[PDB]
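Appendix B. Raw example, untouched.
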Amino acid sequence: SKKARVVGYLSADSFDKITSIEFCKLTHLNIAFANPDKNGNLVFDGDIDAVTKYVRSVNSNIVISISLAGGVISTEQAANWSLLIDKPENRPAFMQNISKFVTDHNLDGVDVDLEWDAVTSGYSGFVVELRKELTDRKKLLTAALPNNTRFVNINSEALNAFDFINIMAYDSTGPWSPNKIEQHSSFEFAKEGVEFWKKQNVPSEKLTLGVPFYGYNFTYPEVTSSTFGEIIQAGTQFADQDEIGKIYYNGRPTILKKVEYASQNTGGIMIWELAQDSFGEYSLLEVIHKKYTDLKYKTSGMCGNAHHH
């Protein structure tokens, strides 16, 4: 059947924007991010129960996961990760803590967003053990992975354990490469990422194509980020292009292209990050929703979608 996922990341710092986010257009919501403290306990700064209560009242079928780690972790958090998963004898208590967090907060799964250097030697054993805990409790286990790099510390059993993966098909350049002044999330980069993970023997259905609701401003040597919402505030005439001088993002036509491509080549679309959108008429989440509906794909089945599915 014509169906697709629409997986949205929501940062803790975005919680006061949830009344503007159309959760009826998502199938999955990832709350970002929880991280371990010095004691092996998962810390989340924010009223996650209030958020999930509200979200489930908007879309009672949404699948809500806690996302772990994330792109921005402190040296202390990264060291706690390494201490907890790189020594197999430290994993047991941490794993129980993760499972109890999922139960205590009535969540549907866990998303692993350990990135780059935080993908340490214990990653695969951690994933395999956590996978069993969650499978046995009928919960999801997913991961966000880089566009076109296979980390040595992600073995095949771990990679295949995930219910699906979220390809981070963006950040091809950024503030860490301030002289590569160009698009950070081109259509070609997205296609490269999908093809790459298929070459890793991940089936199409288990791929989710990430798209960015932000861009980078290379005007000065210090590169800054701009949300799509901020770009539209600068002018609605910018909604349908990808570049303003040295600012590079994804406008509506390019998001639309990526949705058309995803419909034929992956199991869905992933969004970083929901509260960066332009809420209302120019919304990129709306572009995704409308395009999947026009293609006759079921996503949420709400708010106009999947009428004749």
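End of appendix B.
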